[PDB]
Amino acid sequence: LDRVGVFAATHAAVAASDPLQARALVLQLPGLNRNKDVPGIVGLLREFLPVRGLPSGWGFVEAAAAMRDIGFFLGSLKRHGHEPAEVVPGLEPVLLDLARATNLPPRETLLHVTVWNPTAADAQRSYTGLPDEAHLLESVRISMAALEAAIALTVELFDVSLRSPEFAQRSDELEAYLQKMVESIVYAYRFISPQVFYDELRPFYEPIRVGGQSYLGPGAVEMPLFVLEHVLWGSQSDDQTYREFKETYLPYVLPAYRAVYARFSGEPALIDRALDEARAVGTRDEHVRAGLTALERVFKVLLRFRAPHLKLAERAYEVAPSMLGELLTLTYAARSRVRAALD
């Protein structure tokens, strides 16, 4: 999976940045959360919160790293029943400035807490310090860079003719990158206690209010998989619930993925174009048969992520949102279209 390298290196740039010199301070947050010490949590944040304004030399990297370190306090304060912007003076203007500097929402996202978060024991930021949280973060680190590579490959595949042997080849490569999502779920199912997730981790992921609206807490739901699938199969879907789902999470993904999304909203999806071409040319063409077959395997790997993921989520929530089952159904229907072309 040679394409992963560059994405992982960009993540590592943010992970290596500590512009507020906050590492040793943020590591004390788990203890304070365990003690439910709200004044203490506010006090610890005020030790490094740049209430006077952001240093002028900062770029995206520093601002994202700053949002990461302040971010864990945001989830923590809400977990104890407090709007962070209401209990921390001068916090809201800092959060809005960091949002400006990153073109991201004014709170921590999945990216901040996982790939932009250093991995070492003496550096990794966490809400709880629990081994289950460490496993949860690792599960996302397994597949994020591969997913970003997969988005790039999907956009490239879009302009590849089914009549070309490249279609089958690019589809096979895409499947290999998407396999990492399956590995993530396997890991999460093996290593994360459902009870510890539901009782101890879940409380830290509530929404907070900043700038007169609500921003969702970090979650793997924020992974730009929905952008990949928008391009792949979903862009022209008439399912209103599905459209609402994608529009909900769009703000939380990187600006480049929001632009990819907008680019393809007014186009037929890859699947639609590929099926139209297969039907136009005939299935007697060997490159058409091979292209569709390889494309079917892309849907197979998506289902091998999505179906086990539903079980993972239902197991935790038995200690799950209907959105999950509905999306699974949509994905089966998409694969069925491909199977029907080959039949």
Distance CA 140, CA 123 (A): 18
User: Is 319 labelled a binding residue?
Assistant: no
135 is in an annotated binding site: no
Q: Is 219 annotated as a binding residue?
A: yes
C-beta of residue 141 within 8 angstroms of C-beta of residue 117: no
Applying CB under 6 A, among 88, 111, 188, 275 the residue interacting with ligand HEM is 188
The full DSSP string for 231-277 is IIIITT---HHHHHHHHHHGGGS-HHHHHHHHHHHTS--HHHHHHHH
Dist CA 40 CA 36 (whole Å): 9
Residue from the set 104, 253, 288, 313 that interacts with ligand HEM by CB under 6 A: 313
Q: Tell me if 73 sits within 8 A of 108, measured CB to CB.
A: no
113 binds ligand DTE (CB under 6 A): yes
Cα 103 to Cα 61: distance, rounded to the nearest angstrom = 12
- The residue to which tokens 């779920």 are assigned: 185
End-to-end CA distance of the chain: 32
Residues 250-289 as x/- pattern, contact with ligand HEM by CB under 6 A? ----------------------------------------
* 43-71 core/surface letters (b: 16 or more CB in 10 A; e: else): ebbeebbbeeebeeebeebbbbbbbbbbb
> How wide is the angle at C-alpha 28 spanned by C-alphas 10 and 34, nearest 5°?
115
Confirm or deny that 221 is annotated as ligand binding: yes
**Nearest to ligand HEM of 19, 224 (CB atom):** 224
219 binds ligand DTE (CB under 6 A): yes
Q: Considering the rule CB under 6 A, would residue 301 count as an interface residue with ligand HEM?
A: no
How many positions of this chain bind ligand DTE (CB under 6 A)? 9
Give the residue among 229, 225, 138, 222 at the shortest CA–CA distance from 186. Answer: 138
Q: Decide if residue 71 touches ligand DTE (CB under 6 A).
A: no
Strand partners, 214: 209
By CB under 6 A, residue 323 contacts ligand HEM: yes
Give least dist CB 89 to ligand HEM, A: 31
Helix, strand, or coil (residue 209): strand
Stretch that binds ligand DTE, among 38-46, 73-81, 212-220, 276-284 (CB under 6 A): 212-220
With CA atoms as reference, report the closest residue to 309 among 224, 183, 205, 122. Answer: 183
Q: Contact at 8 Å (CB) between 182 and 308?
A: yes
- Partner from ligand HEM, ligand DTE, none binding residue 113, C-beta < 5-8 Å depending on class: ligand DTE
Q: Give the shortest CB-139-to-ligand HEM separation in angstroms.
A: 4
Measured from the CB atom, is 17 or 126 closer to ligand HEM?
126
Examine residue 321 and tell whether it contacts ligand HEM (CB under 6 A).
yes
Question: Residue 213 in 3-state DSSP?
Answer: strand
Which CB, 147 or 220, lies closer to ligand DTE? 220
Q: How far is the CB of 216 from ligand HEM (least distance, A)?
A: 8
| Cβ proximity to ligand HEM, 117 vs 184, nearer residue | 184
Positions touching ligand HEM (CB under 6 A) are 139-140, 143, 184-185, 188, 192, 197, 219-221, 223, 225, 306, 309, 312-313, 316, 320-321, 323-324, 327
Positions touching ligand DTE (CB under 6 A) are 110, 113, 136, 140, 205, 218-221
